[model samples]
Each structure stands twice: as structure tokens, then as C-alpha cells.
Target: MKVLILEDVIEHQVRLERILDEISKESNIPISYKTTGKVREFEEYIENDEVNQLYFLAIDIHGIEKKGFEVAQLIRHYNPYAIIVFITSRSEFATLTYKYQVSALDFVDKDINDEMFKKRIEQNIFYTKSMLLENEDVVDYFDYNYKGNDLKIPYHDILYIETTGVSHKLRIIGKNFAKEFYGTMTDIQEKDKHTQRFYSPHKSFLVNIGNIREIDRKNLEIVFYEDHRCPISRLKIRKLKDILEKKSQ
Candidate 1:
């Protein structure tokens, strides 16, 4: 497998390369990789059919200003089968996903859980593997409940989920904002795969890691303005990790 990364920072390059190398060795994937900070510098590589011999590509740049989608467009033209994932810190930019016409695996925010970032990558691997095993027929969609209106929001436009429970209120995170649902902690987790089960902490909450802004390890809480803060319990932490590690493919 060959992968290309468009990035500007040295630390990011080192971290990504290290992780990718681990992926190559551990999975016996045999991947070749390259990274460049400049988009113009990649023009020749993008045009080269040899570089198009890749299975995956990661693009991390200023989307609005740098026109990352335009880069994505060119890459698609070169290799339609390659999986494209975007890395961004901006939440508002999510609205432009359709304009790019790409089904990105998920969004990673800089604020929280470096663990969650790796989990998202692991999930992408699962997704790719699943697609291969199933002949690309399986469909995974984001699910959520509108606690405010007691409405169930189906998958498609969902960006993430947030689980927040205090002394009285239990909350959920959606694309526009937080939604409070009238239900017990047990009910939400039992309802579907979309919601997470909170135990050990004794409060019921599930968060969609895809839209998380920050994760507080000390408090076992996730701070995401998209929905609400969800807690991870000691007993369920491993399970939650497994879920996020493969939620979206």
C-alpha cells in the first residue's frame, strides 16, 4: 500500500509516519509513504500516475483558505478507489463535506483524546476491511436522539454524538448543538449501537467521538460543543475504546 500525507508541521509528520510504519509492520501491509508541506510541491506527484498507485491518502490543511477539497478533487481524478480522510480542527467546516463529494471516515479535533485519534484510524481500518470482506455493500451511518424534542434523528447528516449526564439532566450532542433526552442512562445504551453505555460512573451517557473537541482524562469526560460531555466508566472504558476503534469504516 502507498499513502501520501499533505501536512506542514514536523511533529505531525513524525507522529503520522511512526503510526503508519507501525501499521505497515503489524498488519504486514507494506506501505510506501511521502509527506510535503507545500501543495504546489505535490503538483507533479499528483499528476504522476505512479504516485496514484496508493490505497489511502490523508490530507491535513486549511480547507477554506488552502482549498483542500480542490486537492481532493485532483486526487480522486487520479485514483478514484483510494480512501480519502480529512484532518481538521475547525467544526464549522464540516458543512462543506458534500461540496467535496467525499465520504470521509470522520473528523479529528486537536483539543482532546490523542487516543481517540488513533481509535478513529483503527476504525477506518476496520471500515476498509469490512468493505473488502463484504464487497462494499455494508453501510454504516451515525445515529442520535434529539433529547430536546424527544425525536430520533436518523443517520446521514449526523456529525457526532455526545453523552452528558449530571444530577438531573442527560444530554446528547448533535450537529447544530446539544439535545437533552428524557430517558434513563440504561435506556439509551440499550436502545442501539449508536449510544454508549456508562457504568462505574453510575450515569448513563454515550458520546460520538467523531465530533469531540476535547477529552478530559482526569474526569473521564469529553467536552464537545456539538452535543454534550459524556463520561467513560472504568468497566466500560475498554469497551468504549473498542467501539470507537471501529465505529466507522
Candidate 2:
């Protein structure tokens, strides 16, 4: 994984760089590092860079107010698969990290000594590498954990995922089988939006864009492979067509 260090303090930035370099040398994986003190400069870098990255961001910036958090949010928007680690002198804002749903890997405190800091950094690097390896085969399918069961579902095998009678349970209709799990359609859609192959034809449905066989616009229904069908909102027909065209390219 690539590395990004965003600390306004020159001394701290240099120290982090050294630690990260040492970790990279110790591990088998090669890591690319980029350091920046300005948030605007970092924004420009992130917008241009498409590599999967591990971000080390300071919680507080010298000039810009809450710039670090804002930068982290922007990072997630552009790179949803990125791993974020917050660096700060105070550790009280840990709750805010979860509140923002930043999916942070770790929070490193400045008060730690050399040994402790190195240990934390080492742990984070190892975890990041593990996650990368677990998702190495993720091209047309992704692994999802449902009720403690890890399932690797192929994109083409899925017909649609719809909300069930219960609030949290989702019914996943596949080619030859259907499974129920506890999840929100919004969560699935947000996580898969980067793929650009999942579309919401209605509030309760998240359909695989590639699995659609035909759109019966007059009847407000979508027919998938094997004649499987689901309701589609009339208002979303135009949006769905646009999404299909945009993603098909």
C-alpha cells in the first residue's frame, strides 16, 4: 500500500517519514511515501492519485481549522478503499472518528515513546497488508461478512438485493439461490458505488447493472437474467438509463 503523511510540524513529519521507511524496509511489501504540510497541496495530490493508499493525517492543522478531518472526508469520497489513521496529541476525539464513519485503521497519539509509536505503526502496516492480500482477487466479486459468515459473491451471480420485511434483513436473489442477511441497501450501495455496476432502481432494490436483461418502462419493472423481475420507480427510469450508459462505458 502507498503511504501519505500530513503533518504541519516539520520535525514530526520527518520523524514519521523515518519510521514508515523503516517499517517498509522490514516488511516484504514495497511502500511509496508522500509527505505534505499543506492541506490544499494534499487535496491536489489525492485528486490526481488513484493508487490505494494508507493515510496518516494530523487531527489539527496549524492554519486551517479542522482541515485534517475535512481532508480525510475528501479522501474517502475520492478513494473509498483507502485506509486512514489519525495522528494527534489528544486522543479524546476518537469518538468523532467513528461518528464520521471514516473507517479509520488506527489513531496514533503523539505522547507515545519511540518504542510504543513504532509498535503501533508496525501493527497498522501489518493490518493494512493483510487487508490488501485478502482483497487481492477482488475484480468482479467482493467478499462480504454476513452474520459471522464470510461469503464471496460474484457480481454476475446476483440478480438483485432487496429490503425484506424486517428492517435490517436484506434478501439477496442470486441465479440459483437466495440468501438473507442483515444489512441496509444504502450501505451496500455506498460501498459498491465505486464499481458503478450496482444501481438503485427503487428505494428497496439494489440491482446489478450487468444482470439486467430488459427494462419494461411502461410496467415500471426490470427483468433480469432467467426472467427474474423487480419493481422500478417511474421517476428513476431516466436516471437508471443514464447510469447504465455511463457505467457500461
Candidate 3:
């Protein structure tokens, strides 16, 4: 998940950064945001964006004929699940702007009472975070039962799964998520055709082939995002390489 802010006013930019920064720290969710004080410059960062982005855009950017709604239309084109919020001083009377239909979460009136503004921002930010956790991307899903409770996690979010050396407890390490559940390595390997995309380079670890960045054959390590690695048994190297080769095509 990612967060972006576009506010032409310097003071508002600082205000947003401060509030967002504070919430990020106290909420304990791993997130960082980038900001730009210009609308035109914001486009470059929107390209090939990471998924589940929360955009805070000033609807009426100073001196720019194009409104944030226009740019949000472009964002919708790129990432439909993006959570957008229109922050503008005149948002109190901006009902007419709703016709643009950019699927914004809220239109916050910055000119409102400071405490009120902060409260709104706080609620929206936390709500947006929950929306992302719900895994709104909808590309693929990992469905299983944990403690008799059915759970569905986004497929690609899973980077790897490893044994925790605790009976019936396996750890699923993902890009921005993690889970410890009851399961066996063999159960996952034979779960379904979709799970076959994962290859166990070692007895204790099953890794997502598509999520791997590199396989250090010399060191017998399978490297994943964030430089995380797990040992790849020498005996399994040949079969793993063959699986990777077939997947490449």
C-alpha cells in the first residue's frame, strides 16, 4: 500500500504531512507518503503506481484550470481501487463537483474548524487503511480455513510461507501482511493448481516463484523482496530451476 499527497498550498502540505506522519506512527501500520506541491508534477509519480494507493488531492489547486477531479479520473483509469479524498477550502459548497464521479471517499473542507478537519482526516485515513486490508485489489485470492474460520488473503501479497517449529503453526510472510496459522507444507503444495506456482526450495519454506527477486545459487539461498532469503536445499536446486524455467515462458 502507498499514500500520496498533492497540495499546492505550502501550509496545507505541511499540515497534511504532519497529521499523516503522526497517524502512521501511532497506528503501527507500515506506511509512508510522498508529497508534491504542484498538480502538473503529480502525474509522473502516478504512472505504474503500486497497488492500493490512498491519494489526498486538493480539489481546487491554486492557479490551475484542471481540478483534482480530472487527475483523479486518470487515477481511476490506472488503479480502480485507489482511495481518493478531495481537500479544498471551498469543499463545504462543492456539491456540484460530485458530477465528476471520481469515486472519492470524501470532500473535506479545509476551512472548517481545525479540530473538525483533523477528525475527518483521521477517520478517513484509518478507514482507507481498513479498506486496503480487506484486499480490495481483487486480482487473486488465497482461501483457507484457520481455526475453523474461513480466511481469504490476496494471493500475490504472499511472498513466502515458513515453518515456525511450533506444532501446526506456519508463518505466512507477505509483502505488507503476515499470518501464523495451522497448516502443513504438503497441504499447501497440493492445495490446488494455483498454489503449484509456489516451489519449496527447502523442507521448511515454500516461496512464491513470482515474488522472488533472485535465487543465489552459489549461496544456496532463495531471495525475496526486502532482501529476505531462505536456504534452498542443494538436492532441490535442479527441480526448482526447472520449474522456474517453465514459468519464465
Candidate 4:
């Protein structure tokens, strides 16, 4: 997801950028942000670059630029459903959410400790990401639980979900991350609602059709997500080609 951060303080800007960087790496999702200390710069960037999905705006810019809510109003005009997370020292604005009415996802207190600050940003990101997906297969999540909290695996980010030798255990090979968990392929196979159009060319593998890069008929290989390849059954090759060809249309 693309992001934009507007904060006057250099330290706070770096902190938010660092948190966003960490989340992108940890989740293996392509999340990058543009940071600006002034409203003119922020507005210019948004004009040149396409509007972003998520925004972190300092409620008080402490300069001649408009307030966070005012800027957010412009953002809403361009993109009605933009997820806005306000960064501010005043906690009272959290109660005044309705009056401001910029459709803010959350109001974060800048005075909050560093750890708490990270948590708040992370929380807002996840909340907004889920909301956006709740509102498409292209952005859907592979709903699953990790150690504790539910891990929202980026559905379209995955290459394939393959079975492991261990019973009921599976591994998802993806663009920038690899993950292991226990589950049945058949159970996950039925998740067609937000599946992003995956197809099993072999029983051991459920490959993402959208991510496929090549189909090697000579070796019965389905190359996808750059270097990863899944062995395809001979009989299913025809079906794979039909699906791929139809997808192109």
C-alpha cells in the first residue's frame, strides 16, 4: 500500500518512516511512504504522485499550511475512502472526531512513548488495510492465526501454497516472505471468495494464477513470483493454459 506522512518534526518523521519500513519488511508487502514537513510540499507530491491509500498527518503542522483535517478534506475530495491517521498531542480531538469528519481511522497522541507510538501506527495501518480489503481479491488477506494475533497474509502477494511432508502442515512461498503453518490444502482450496484466482496444477501445490510468470511445458513447470516454480501434473496443464489465457482477456 502506498503511504504519505506529513510531520514537521524531523525526528517524528523518521520514527514514522522507520515504523512503516519495518512493517513492509515484516509483512513482505510493498508499503512505501512520502514524508513532508510542509503542506505545499505534501500537496505537490500528492499532485505529481497518485493519491495514496494511507496517510499519517500531524494534526498541527505548526506552520502556515492548513490543519491536518483540512488537508484530509482535500484528500477525501480526491479519494473519498483514504485512510487517515492523525498525529497530534491533543487527546481531546479523539472525542471531536465527528465534528472534524475527515473519516480518520484513528487519532494518535504524539506524546505517547516510542513503543506506544509504533503500536498506534501499526494498529492504524492494519485496521485500514483490512478495511480496504473488506471493502476485493486484489487486496484480500489470507486469514490465519500466527503465534497470537491473526496474521493477515497478503493474499495476492503469495506465489503458492504447497503441502509439506508433515501432516496438515503447509508452506506459502511468496514474493518477499516465506511462512509455514498447519492446515489442509483442501480446506484452503475452498477459499475462493478472496482467493485471487489460485489453481492447483498439482495436488501438492496451489499456485497463484495472477503471479505466474511462465509455463514450461517441456518440464511441466509453472514458474511464478520470479524464480519459484511448481511442478504441474501433465493432465492439469491444459486447464492451466485455459485459465491463463482467459485471465489475459
Q: Which is the leading candidate under lDDT? A: 2
lDDT winner, 2 or 4:
2
Estimate, for each residue in 1-249, the C-alpha lDDT of model 1 and write its tens digit: 445676666766676677677766777655567777777876665653221133233344544453666787776654544566665555566677667876555654534466666665656555654443323343553222334222333333333333454543454444444444444555545665444322223334444444454555667665555434555535456455545645657
Residue pair clashes in candidate 2: none
1-249, model 2: which lDDT tens digit per residue?
A: 557788999988888888888887787667778888887788877754423467889977887656778888878765555678988875787778867768888999978997899898888889876754566646777555544333455677778878898876777777655666556777676777686667777778877778787776677788787787655756545575656655654
lDDT of 3: 0.71
Regions of candidate 4 where Cα sits further than 4 Å from its true position: 48-52, 63-66, 133-249
For candidate 2, report its TM-score: 0.57
Candidate 2 ranges beyond 4 A from true positions: 63-65, 134-249
lDDT computed for candidate 4:
0.70
**How many backbone overlaps does candidate 4 show?**
0
Best-to-worst ranking by TM-score: 2, 3, 4, 1
What does the lDDT read for residue 196 in candidate 2?
69
The alpha-carbon deviation from the true structure for residue 161 of candidate 4, after best TM-score superposition, in angstroms, is 35
Question: What are the per-model C-alpha RMSD values against the true structure?
Answer: 19.3, 13.3, 11.5, 12.8
lDDT of each: 0.51, 0.73, 0.71, 0.70
Query: Which is superior by lDDT, 2 or 3?
Result: 2
Residue 142 error for model 1, in Å? 30
Off by over 4 Å in 3: 134-249
Root-mean-square deviation of candidate 4: 12.8
The prediction achieving the highest TM-score against the true structure is: 2
